[PDB]
Symmetry: D2
Subunit: 239 residues, 4 copies
């Protein structure tokens, strides 16, 4: 029995009733997957039994296993990872929250002229072992069919635009993505595990714990190559 | 009467020579002047020493229907507007009277009293600026609408891109009467306004004129903005303006401007 | 009665435990609460199931002088302000009532009725944001002044007519010296119309620049409300933001506000009232 | 007899009455120099006799000769920013090809006090991306006039100690004030024209409004000194060596 409890209007849900591990039924896995897609980031609590091997075994059921700043993970490659699982190991006595934003909700909220702009824009993403890729600013989510924004801090520029225009448009879209209403902010506790849809989110690791020691363990799941609204795929420039 | 046109810059501006400007010009001469205006956006006549207010107005009559001087600034029904340095310096990029539906199509401005230095006027081509837009920004402009106001309160929603009724060319319609873009947050209106205005006022899309006695400028207010430079300190400066009635902007899909407040019937007819 | 303070983040936020909040607390307890408030900027009490409007007000009385609810929104002379979702949602970064000279020093906000999801509130430290400024931007902030002013359904129009019934305009320094801590703090937020002596385009750019630094997630704490929760914040060293992420669900909190003093800039100059009179709203603390 | 005719309130003057060349009196040279410092860019006309050698001989009297559709000050990526340039028309397009200048002195005076002080305390990284990188003050004290002037333009990569987003916003704010039309003069070149500008108190912009018609002007540049800020601190070279370009 997988119960899903919404945390906010546009993003975030708690999951309850699941002892997380590699031995879950297909019904349970696909209910977890359904929640992930709908809510964008989901949180399990009380997973005291869970270790690295268990986290990995669990990850294997959801896909194929593989920063004080707003970003989507590893967008400087063509095959942007679809999701990540993050488990608390050692937490500071204060701070160390993480925030997520819905790039789906942000798109839906765009007025028509700005939607169409986003639909037609392409962005150069890089890691500066050099990677450079041109991604559409709007990609069609391969599992939900929903249109979602693809931006974040690996964006160097928008194709065909002056740098001053890239800066202004990037800020305009980012402002809409990171509006507090499109975000959820999680306070980590021991036994917590978060899973997010990296195709429909950005996130931000808040450095508000003064460099107290903090360890979480991440498993990342392979994704596909973004397709734009007209069927065009991302173009790898380097890497 | 030969009307010779000399280009001043790639995208905007021409001098006109060979015409004693007045109300007694042939249709061939008038339509050659009109053709130059549309192609070059602002045109300049010089040495018009004989020209007075009545002559300027008689000449204006041949190119269109003179407007009341201004919707709100006119003392009565007079067709001449004083551009007098004691009352204002329009030190800001704009298209004339865009807060009404019937944006005037053109203005004629004649030098009367000039400062010993400064007092230039600049014009920008809102046609060239559009052509220069990369495709995603063109389409954005094509789909944006702007609220223009004069704060007799006037408020009108115009398309950011209008199709020029005589040339068929697409041209930007912005300038300082824009309060906001319809449906957008104010921060987004500010950023996009600056983006488009930056492209309009790029020096390459502008011509800047040094006024001399006997000069007369005519500009296509559907395809330009202009700016009166206040670089003459406190010197007295007077030019006389006649404005010609225009039509209601139509966007790229055939939609017309939407009046929210005010009534311009008294200011001018629809041309 | 032990008052235990638990930090929530590096630059802002603490939980308070061990206090049954009310009007009958010892001076030691009150001053320990006050000390936590100044250090942590916003503090949170939980499990205050016994607490009602009268109790909240009795408690507020120990920490300062309650104001009239609001300069313009108050029906009369009542000290409680409804934060009611039918009338308004303050989905915007601000410091309370900065359009008067006597900016209230603090507010107490108690949960009454909560949505099943969302409805979080965030606070930012305008103290930490100042400390984090590089020297040239500090000196800029030190020398800037800002003009603050107060300018669908019937409930919503009422709210807005009432809010603006009288006009208020005041020039405040962008940096004020905190009268209890001595710390320099930014004073901005959404009542700012412009910066004195600057072009509007420059006011917009500088406002965004400073606000960006204030609202950086690192300088914020975001609270999930539960029944029995009560928040108290230092309105001299914060801004806050009511997040509208609960769709059309009903949400009510009750606010009591405490009288503050007139901001002084870094050179000893005080705020200059241009319009409005706040004598009726509150005294100067 | 050197007559100076103002072109605008804050910048620009025509010079008349001088056959420009290497054989001018000290009185004439220093009157030309005085006009340059006051007006920031000055224009001679009708100099049909003037050739490259003559332009250079004339330049020699005003300093030590050294040996862009975008607002800039020349060669600010070195410590020894050249003090001035002389530009003579050789071959002009039939239309367009204007040049504009802006006064970085007037722009400073016009700043409200808080923004002045900001400018007084800001430093900028200038580069040419032979890689050159130098940190210059945003406000320098002009060594001949004593007037404070802004030092920005398109070689600025960033402001020292600031986030890039802040550098972009402040750069645009100051540049907006510099290039305000009121602080500029725009010159229409004619054969026989020669312009001289004070590169310590200006920026300029070559307008590309002649569609790639052929256009030639000849430039001679005069060696300058190292900027000093409002507190006596000098520019800090991070990379490159300008000894070969010019002396101080
Ligand atoms: Fe990450
Ligand atoms: Fe005008
Ligand atoms: Fe509030
Ligand atoms: Fe140059």
């Amino acid at each position: 029995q997988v119960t899903v409890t919404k945390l906010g209007a546009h993003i975030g849900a708690r999951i309850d009733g699941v002892r997380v591990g590699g031995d879950l039924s297909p019904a349970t896995v696909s209910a977890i997957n359904a929640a992930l897609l709908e809510h964008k980031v989901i949180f399990f609590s009380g997973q005291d039994h869970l270790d690295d091997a268990g986290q990995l075994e669990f990850a294997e059921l959801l896909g194929t296993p593989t920063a004080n700043s707003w970003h989507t993970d590893v967008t400087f490659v063509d095959r942007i990872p679809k999701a990540s699982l993050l488990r608390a190991v050692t937490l500071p006595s204060y701070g160390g929250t993480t925030a997520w934003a819905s790039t789906e909700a942000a798109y839906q909220q765009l007025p028509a002229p700005l939607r169409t702009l986003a639909d037609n824009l392409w962005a150069v993403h890089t890691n500066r072992d050099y990677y450079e890729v041109e991604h559409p600013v709007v990609r069609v989510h391969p599992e939900t069919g929903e249109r979602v924004l693809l931006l974040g801090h690996f964006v160097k520029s928008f194709v065909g635009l002056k740098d001053t225009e890239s800066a202004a448009l990037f800020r305009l879209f980012q402002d809409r993505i990171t509006r507090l209403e499109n975000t959820v902010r999680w306070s980590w506790k021991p036994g917590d595990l978060a899973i997010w849809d990296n195709r429909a989110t950005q996130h931000y690791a808040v450095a508000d714990y003064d460099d107290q020691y903090r360890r979480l363990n991440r498993v990342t799941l392979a994704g596909d190559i973004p397709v734009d609204v007209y069927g065009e795929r991302s173009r790898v420039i380097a890497g």
